[PDB]
Structure formats: C-alpha cells, structure tokens
Design a protein around this nucleic acid. Structure first.
Ligand SMILES: [Cl-]
Ligand SMILES: [Cl-]
Ligand SMILES: [Mg+2]
Ligand SMILES: [Mg+2]
Ligand SMILES: [Mg+2]
Ligand SMILES: [Mg+2]
Ligand SMILES: [Mg+2]
Ligand SMILES: [Mg+2]
Ligand SMILES: [Mg+2]
Ligand SMILES: [Mg+2]
Ligand code: NA
Ligand code: NA
Ligand code: NA
Ligand code: NA
Ligand code: NA
Ligand SMILES: [Sr+2]
Ligand SMILES: [Sr+2]
Ligand SMILES: [Sr+2]
Ligand SMILES: [Sr+2]
Ligand SMILES: [Sr+2]
Ligand SMILES: [Sr+2]
Ligand SMILES: [Sr+2]
Lengths: 140, 186, 160, 95, 154
RNA sequence: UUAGGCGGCCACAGCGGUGGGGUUGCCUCCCGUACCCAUCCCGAACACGGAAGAUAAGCCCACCAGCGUUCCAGGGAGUACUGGAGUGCGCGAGCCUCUGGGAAAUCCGGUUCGCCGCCACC
RNA sequence: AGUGCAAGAGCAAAAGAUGACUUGACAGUGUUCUUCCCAACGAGGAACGCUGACGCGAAAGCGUGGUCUAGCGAACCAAUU
RNA sequence: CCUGUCAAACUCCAAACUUACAGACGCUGUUUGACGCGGGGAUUCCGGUGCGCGGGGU
C-alpha cells in the first residue's frame, strides 16, 4: 500500500530564461544530456517583436540523470516552505524545478484511455517536503 | 457540469477510447473495420461491421485463445500479434467477410508495429485490406527473431516461466503452419 | 414637449445601447430615499403607488413626481424621518423626435422613459403607523405629475 | 431583406443549441437510404459539407438515387419540383 | 351525432371556413346536415363554430325534420315512412332517425341528400352576433336548445 | 464483462464524494531498452520486450444528491400569450365575452450518480 | 483563444497551434440548387459527380483554393493558347 | 449575501400558430376527364378600404 504511494521524481527541468544562446554550453555539461531552445508569443516592447525566436533553453531530466543532478544541485539551495507548489513541486534559483508524483502518473500522461489523477492520489506539499527532506537535506 | 450551456463530450470521447474524426473517415469506405487493439499482456483483433444499435463483430481473435492451437509462448509480442491477426482473418473468411479496412484506434502508425503485424496477418488469411508493404516489419521480426537474438545477450534468461532458454521463433513457423492448414477447428 | 407624444406604447422596445448613441442622461436624481440603511421589513406599514393604465413615463416626469413626493415626506417627517421610499422603475426606453419633411424621418435621440404596465407599483414607501397619512399625501402629489390615474394601495397595515 | 445571399436570415435555423455544439456523431453521416425512402431535410450546423439551400429546411423529400456519396432527393417547392443534392448528415428517415 | 345549421352568410367569411362548410355538404344559409362525432368531424365544426348552430337533436325532433325536409339524392320525392321503407335499410323514419343518431349509416348511404334544406326559424332565431351563452344563436346547443331551433325551422 | 474490445443514444451519462475488488485468469499501474519505432531535450510520451511487485491510481462493483442535467406530481395557472367570432365595454391607448389552444419564472415533493447493442470471457 | 476582412454562423485527439512535405488555386466534362422562394430570365456563385493527371497519408481518406454567406461583367474587336 | 430594473439587432426557456410528407374522414374526378401536359388569345404591372400583425412619423 505504502509502496504504490511513495513519491518519485517525474522530472527535473533546468532552465535559463535569457531574452536573446551562448548559455546552451553550460547546461549540457552540468546536466549530462542535450538542451533545447525556447521561443515566445505576443509582441513585447523590450525589443522582443520576433515571435518565434531563441530566448531561452531548458533540459528535462529523468531517472538517473535527474537524481545524479539533484545530489549536486540541492546542496546549492536553501529550500523554503513557500517554495512548494500545491501539487508538491518546488522551484529554486538558472532555475531548477523538480516534478514529484506517486507511482501511477502514467495514467494521466498516456494516450489511450488517459485520466486525470484524483485529488487523493495527488501529492501534497507536506508529503513532498517529507520525501525530499528524507533524502540528504533540511526543510523550512 | 458547470451549467445548462455547458457541453459535455460524447461518452466514448470522455473516456478517451474513440477518435470520432478517424472513425468517420474509416466508415466512409463501406467495408468492415479490422479493429486492431493491444494490451500489456495481450493483442486482440476484431472484424467489425456497422449496426443499427451499435457495431457488429462478425469475427474476432484474442491472443489468449491463441494457445488453444499450441502456443506455449508469451502473448504480447510480434509473433503473437501477427498470429492473432491471421486467426481473426481466417475466422472472418469463414463468416463470409472478404474485405476490410485497418482501424488502429488510438495506437500509432509506427513502421513495423504490432497493429501492422495484425494487419499483415489478416491479409495473409485471405482478406483484402488496403495496406502498404514497406510500413510492415520485415518477415523475421514478425517471426520473433529480434527477441531470440535479444536472449542471445543472455547471462540471465529473458523468460521467467520456462518456455525455453534460447527461445523459438520456429514455434511461430509451427503455429502459422497449423493455421494455414485446411483442417483446424476455428 | 407634451407627454402626448410619448405616453403610449406604440413603438418597438428601443433599449439596445450598443446600437443607439447620444442618449441624454437621466434627470432622476435618486431611486432609494429616506433611510436606505434600514430594511423594508423593519416597518409596520408599506404603501405603494399603482399605475392604473399601461404607459411610458419620461424621466422628466419620474423626477418631477418623485421629487414632489419625497420633498413632502422630508417636510413632514424631517430630512431623516423614519421612512424609506423607493422608485422601482428605470427609464430604459429611448425616445426620438423627427426634429427634410417626411424624407429620412427616423428621429434623433431626445430622451428616455419607463414602461409601466397597468396594476404595477411605480413607488413603494415604508413607514410607521403614525406617518401613513403623510406618505399617502406624498403619493397624492406624485400621481398629479404622471400621465395615468393611480391607486394608493396599503400593502401592510390594518391600523385603521 | 437587406441582402440576398443564401445565408440571409438563417441565423436561427443554422445554429446549434449550446448542448448540441461541437462535432456530430458519424453514424447519421454514413446512414444508407433507399430509392423511394422518405427523408426529412434538416441541415446539421456542425456539418459544413453536403448542405442544401437553407430555404429547404423542413422539407420531406423522396430519395431517388445518389450522386457520389451524396443523395439526390426530390421535393416540391411550392408547386415546382426540384432535385436536391444532400449528404446523409443532413437527412433523417420519416416515421 | 350533431346537427349543423348555417346561420351566417358566405359574404366576408374566411375562405377556409366557407370551404369547410361546403365539405360538410352545406352551401346555403339555413341548410342543415347530420355530422358524426369523430375527431376529424369535431375539428371541422370548431372551425365553423361562429357561423353555425349545432348540437345533438332528440330522436323526435330528428324524425319531424327528416319527414318535413329530407329529400332523395334526386327529385322532390317525399321522404315518408313508405319512402324510407322501399329505399332504405329501415322500416320507417324512426328506424332511420335512430341509426343516424347511433351513427350506423348516413343520409347519403341511404340514397338521401346529405342536406336538410330547412325553412327560416318561425318567430326568428336568437341572433347571429352572439353565442348561446350570451343569449345568441351561434355555436353549440343543448339537446333542448337545438330542437327548439330545428323545430322552429320545420 | 471477478475488472475485456468495438459501439449506439451523446450530462438521465456532468461536477463532487463514500465504500469494496484481483497467485499461475483480465485490465492496469508496474519492470525494462537488444531490437521496429521514438523525443526540435528527455524509453516522459510514442514504440518495442517483459513480469519482481501492487490493488494505491485508473478501470470494474456497490452507494450518496450538495451542484449541473432528464423526467414526473402538486402549486404558480387555465394565469401570460394566442387562432376563430361579436351592432360587447372604453374619449382613447386599450379591454371584455364566447370558441379552440396554452406557457415561463418560481415553490414544493419525487426522479436522475446513465440506458441499450454486438463480440469475447469462470 | 484562434481561424485575413462586416455581421451572423461553424470548429478542440480541430476547421485552431506547431512542424514537415506539397502545389487540387490542376485539365476535361457534367448533375443539381442558387442567381430569379412560389414562377419564366443571362453573367456570376455553390454543392455534388464522372474522366485524366497528381499531392499527402499506413490506410480509410482528404485536396474541384482560403470554415460558411460579399470580392463582380454581354455582343462586337484585339492580344494570347 | 441582500435589494431595484431592462432588451428590434439577448436567450437557460417558450407558445398560440405557420409549414414539409403521409394515413384517415370529408369533398372531388374517371359520359361534367379531374391532376397534368402542349398550343392560341389576352387583359394587367397608378389601386383602395376594413380587420389582425406590423415598421416610420407628434
Ligand atoms: Cl489499443
Ligand atoms: Cl439546394
Ligand atoms: Mg428570426
Ligand atoms: Mg335534389
Ligand atoms: Mg315575424
Ligand atoms: Mg335581431
Ligand atoms: Mg481502494
Ligand atoms: Mg367604441
Ligand atoms: Mg463596343
Ligand atoms: Mg491579351
Ligand atoms: Na432634403
Ligand atoms: Na453536434
Ligand atoms: Na529551433
Ligand atoms: Na485501486
Ligand atoms: Na449560371
Ligand atoms: Sr407606431
Ligand atoms: Sr394623473
Ligand atoms: Sr519505465
Ligand atoms: Sr385623450
Ligand atoms: Sr387543454
Ligand atoms: Sr470549403
Ligand atoms: Sr409567418
């Protein structure tokens, strides 16, 4: 019962919202895998009239690539309480966001007969802190 | 849900089981649908015609009942898929069904996939279905050579319950051989 | 202009402001009178002014009758007496005037009126038993400034 | 009318009631009719193709053959006989 | 079974209403017909309501009227018992009158004109500007009320 | 249907909630990347291969009406409106009688937490 | 929300967004409705076929321009294939 | 929450009623040939009034 309910890391997305690039080189070395560009929508007065164009970049980390990154990424941030999502996700800092969820998330991510995860099976801020804290660090 | 003006999707849409747009294009042919559907452990193939109160299944075949002809192997792979299609195809031929159009539901048209395998099976059973030869996997992968050579990279048996250590794509040959045979109690 | 020109309901409902422009503001100063903080149920008596004929009352008459009515209540009950009168109708109907003979006759926007059906309550005051004869007099003054004949009907008051 | 196009004054007849919004069921868009069959004509707002002139909504014609997948339905406009090209999507069996 | 009597002329009356009267075999003022009480026939009298006088007559009254105003499909032949006896499926007027009321046959089925061309009401009717409930003569009548009219138009 | 597939009608089926159910069976979540295939970055998804584990998800089963919806009884209402007729009333805008139809809001009590078709299957 | 532009209407595993490929905005010839309700009348328009040649897709299928209703022109003469 | 009002270019609702087709009754047609088809000849394309429903206009 406690097994199919104990959390795991869905994904860790490292991202750098610039505004115009030369930053792709560092993400590849710090994460391990390849990066991807970032575009935008709607014209902006801050010299951002070009809709579809490189502005940032991100890298979605999964499985080992995620944890091996977090081991040497969490010790660099002072995790707070408010830094947690209502869904039990936290973002700190170069931004680093960690997506947390219970063993049956595929139900909402698949194509065939997909379904949205029930609120009871949805991770909580409290249940999130607990799992994370129970792995090399402190809360609040 | 919200109010009177609210629009609730069709049931089979809410459930995310039927792509109604593809459903229509499919029905336009006038021919019966060769419904190809998979599962984690199994693979099913139905021949569906259109009916007044709902669709009519004239002939079907599930990978589970594949064993009834001498299948000691798993039921969620390529050889399994092809064979299931051939069985369903043969049963269909018996019921008068002569032509059909491949319905793959929410599955993807990936080259060499199991739904195309199911398709190649039904076609081989004597059915006339609009297809594309180069989108089907090569004869050997259908046989299950990809899995036999995977087991070659042993050190640990690919199969838990003993069917065999090195696996047998030859079993596929034996089973196909059995179905194509004139006798066989369908 | 005479009310004879606009009193009857003889044109279609013309209220859509998304299609009408240049509509003059309403002369009606207030719709809530007396002590608007107190509730209507906090009063023993409730007397309404009832329009006996279906008509169109222009905002000029609404203001004039409403004024001459509340002005009396103020004079007899003080500027803060224990009462509260209400004008429940609002001038939604936009009026025109063809002010070029009959060619391109569609008139220009000149005003607004409230369409009140017969038997409807135009005004409704709420007072204490002792003040009832004053509110009845405010209405007698108010009905003299609107087109139709009216009834002064006591809705809550067996104090007679 | 201010204009004389086909959709003139078809605001109501060619609009779905809220709960009938969105794509229509494929069943009735594939239904098969036989020559001689009485069919009710009614445009399905959700279906763009295979319509007839809006002026003909409510007519109950007689299927007298087909052109391609669409049907050829005979009606009597006032006193004049006309043949209408319409797809099953906009047809219903009588009775 | 009801007895319809046109009391208002054709001039100015709606065509569809006038056509209904003609379908009910009645083409002149004061002409009377016997109509069965069916859903279809009921719709027809409702339409003619304001230009007619109707209601179910008493067997007696019907007999009086048939004797005095009924005619063969052709000719002036008097429709008396002997006539009824030799042409109809009955022995006498009463037998016929009974069958009409019980709705077993029609004047036509018996070779009789569908219309009973009545005489103007003696002493005059109650007026063609108001219904029965308002003291007029138009619309549905009492079995006694209809009789008074039919008998007055002997 | 002791959990399946394809559907019809497309909320009576929605929203929200409670309880129950799975040793070689089913559906799943699940485990895993040599292959077919896959990601503008990620075996996440898609695709392929597979069972160590699980019934917590989903799904199936049973049930709750608070919201939304369907229908029914009574009330509002034969009121509002209305097809036919009138030497009926009103200065008039307008109303009334007779005849044939007949709401909406809303109140209240019930109903509804889907129904049906085909195939497969302890 | 978006879908070029009035207004009204259509559309959500799309008719919208993104990406890639592509030129069916193709040739020929019709049926039908519209233009012109009923009820005759041209140009124009649309829906729906067929023949030919193609594009895309695994395939059913979709493409006779733009989601629908505006964006149009006789005879004579000239140029052009 | 409470409280006060509206819509030709609003609609969660919603008539009476008009209308397509069919059956039934009615009426009508098969010597008065209807329904329909083809042909000859027109006149006509200043209308008006009542009632109902209207739109403009004091
Ligand atoms: Cl599937
Ligand atoms: Cl058409
Ligand atoms: Mg309209
Ligand atoms: Mg005679
Ligand atoms: Mg006399
Ligand atoms: Mg008299
Ligand atoms: Mg449970
Ligand atoms: Mg008078
Ligand atoms: Mg010239
Ligand atoms: Mg030229
Ligand atoms: Na002028
Ligand atoms: Na629809
Ligand atoms: Na890019
Ligand atoms: Na569960
Ligand atoms: Na033309
Ligand atoms: Sr007027
Ligand atoms: Sr007055
Ligand atoms: Sr995995
Ligand atoms: Sr006057
Ligand atoms: Sr009734
Ligand atoms: Sr189009
Ligand atoms: Sr009309």
């Amino acid at each position: 019962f406690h097994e199919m309910r104990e959390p795991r890391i869905e994904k860790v997305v490292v991202h750098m919202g610039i505004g115009h690039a030369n930053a792709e080189d560092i993400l590849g070395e710090i994460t391990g895998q390849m990066p991807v560009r970032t575009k935008a929508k709607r014209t902006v007065g801050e010299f951002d009239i070009r809709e579809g164009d490189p502005i940032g970049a991100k890298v979605t980390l999964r499985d080992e690539m995620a944890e091996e990154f977090l081991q040497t990424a969490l010790p660099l941030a002072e995790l707070a309480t408010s830094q947690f999502d209502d869904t039990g996700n936290f973002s700190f800092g170069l931004d680093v966001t960690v997506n947390l969820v219970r063993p049956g998330y595929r139900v909402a991510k698949r194509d065939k007969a997909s379904r949205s995860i029930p609120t009871k099976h949805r991770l909580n801020p409290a249940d999130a802190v607990a799992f994370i804290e129970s792995t090399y660090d402190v809360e609040v | 849900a919200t109010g009177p003006r609210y629009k609730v999707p069709m049931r089979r849409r809410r459930e995310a089981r039927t792509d109604y747009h593809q459903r229509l294009r499919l029905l336009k042919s006038g021919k019966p649908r060769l419904v190809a559907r998979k599962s984690n452990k199994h693979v099913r193939a139905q021949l569906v015609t259109l009916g007044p109160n709902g669709d009519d299944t004239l002939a079907s075949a599930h990978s589970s009942d594949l064993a009834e002809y001498g299948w000691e192997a798993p039921t969620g792979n390529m050889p399994s898929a092809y064979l299931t299609g051939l069985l369903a195809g043969l049963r269909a031929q018996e019921a008068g069904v002569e032509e059909a159009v491949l319905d793959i539901g929410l599955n993807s048209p990936t080259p060499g996939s199991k739904v195309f395998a199911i398709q190649e099976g039904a076609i081989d059973a004597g059915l006339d279905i609009p297809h594309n030869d180069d989108v089907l996997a090569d004869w050997q992968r259908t046989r299950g050579a990809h899995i036999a050579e995977y087991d070659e990279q042993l050190e640990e048996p690919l199969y838990s319950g003993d069917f065999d250590a090195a696996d047998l794509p030859e079993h596929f040959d034996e089973l196909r051989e059995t179905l194509l045979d004139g006798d066989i109690e369908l | 202009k005479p009310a004879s020109m606009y009193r009857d309901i003889d044109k279609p409902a013309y209220t859509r402001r998304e299609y009408i422009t240049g509509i003059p503001g309403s002369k009606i100063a207030q719709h809530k009178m007396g002590r608007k903080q107190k509730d209507a149920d906090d009063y023993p008596v409730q007397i309404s002014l009832i329009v006996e004929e279906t008509v169109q009352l222009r905002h000029g008459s609404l203001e004039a009758s409403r004024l001459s009515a509340n002005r009396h209540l103020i004079k007899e009950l003080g500027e803060e007496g224990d009462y509260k009168m209400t004008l429940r109708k609002f001038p939604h109907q936009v009026l025109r005037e063809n002010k070029d003979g009959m060619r391109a006759a569609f008139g220009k926007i000149v005003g607004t009126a409230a369409r009140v059906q017969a038997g409807e309550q135009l005004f409704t005051a709420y007072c204490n038993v002792e003040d009832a004869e004053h509110v009845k007099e405010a209405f007698r003054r108010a009905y003299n400034k609107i087109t139709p004949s009216c009834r002064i009907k006591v809705e809550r008051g067996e104090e007679l | 009318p201010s204009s004389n196009g086909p959709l003139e004054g078809t605001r109501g007849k060619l609009k779905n009631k809220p709960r009938d919004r969105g794509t229509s069921p494929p069943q009735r868009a594939v239904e098969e009719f036989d020559d001689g069959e009485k069919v009710h004509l009614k445009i399905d707002p959700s279906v763009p193709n295979g319509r007839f002139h809006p002026r003909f909504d409510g007519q109950t014609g007689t299927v007298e053959g087909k052109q391609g997948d669409a049907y050829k339905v005979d009606i009597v406009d006032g006193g004049k006989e006309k043949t209408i090209i319409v797809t099953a999507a906009h047809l219903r069996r009588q009775e | 079974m009801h007895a319809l009597v046109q009391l208002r002329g054709e001039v100015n009356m709606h065509t569809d209403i006038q056509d209904t009267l003609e379908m009910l075999n009645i083409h002149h003022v004061n002409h009377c017909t016997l109509v069965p009480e069916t859903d279809a026939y009921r719709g027809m009298v409702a339409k003619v309501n304001d230009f007619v006088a109707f209601g179910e007559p008493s067997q007696e009254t019907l007999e009086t009227v048939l004797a005095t105003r009924a005619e063969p499909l052709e000719g002036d032949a008097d429709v008396d018992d002997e006539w009824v006896a030799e042409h109809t499926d009955y022995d006498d007027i009463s037998g016929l009158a009974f069958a009409l009321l019980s709705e077993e046959t029609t004047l036509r089925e018996q070779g009789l004109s569908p219309t009973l061309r009545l005489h103007p009401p003696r002493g005059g009717h109650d007026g063609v500007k108001h219904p029965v409930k308002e003291g007029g003569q138009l619309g549905k009548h009492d079995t006694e009320g209809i009789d008074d009219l039919l008998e007055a138009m002997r």
